[PDB]
Symmetry: C2
């Protein structure tokens, strides 16, 4: 049926979403790593309004990453349920 | 009937993906802008630090450009799919 192609398409879309999430997560966590290290490298050197801006940005980003992990976990769980359901209808 | 439930569910998921994208892009473009300002500003191991910052800015810049592309493509494939699915539930 034409549900077979839709299931097949969505399965691929979902896999790509997963793969692109892992890449994105790696890039951003490395980025956050390298910003965190710098907040402390500037804190050594310590005019120092820069430490405050940098510390704010780390926290901004870190919070974004923790939030993001939670959102992706919920989306993934919805998509797998839905994918499973759709497979059953195709069977 | 089951198809209508799937469609309804997928729709909400795709909608939530979009809105969460809108949020994240906004959150990360502000972030980038504030990095931008801070780089500019510090330009006015101190010069190690401007190098560390300007590198980060461009990594993030590159990342956001690429995500735009990836999201654009995934949004359209999901839109196409919902429409093909829509066509199938009311048939
Ligand atoms: Cl990590
Ligand atoms: Pt991390």
């Amino acid at each position: 049926g034409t549900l077979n192609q839709l299931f097949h398409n969505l399965n691929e879309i979902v896999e790509d979403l997963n793969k692109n999430w892992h890449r994105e997560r790696r890039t951003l966590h490395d980025f956050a790593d390298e910003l965190h290290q710098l907040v402390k490298h500037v804190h050594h050197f310590m005019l120092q309004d820069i430490v405050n801006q940098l510390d704010k940005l780390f926290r901004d980003l870190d919070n974004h990453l923790q939030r993001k992990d939670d959102t992706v976990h919920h989306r993934h769980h919805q998509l797998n349920k839905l994918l499973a359901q759709l497979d059953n209808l195709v069977h």
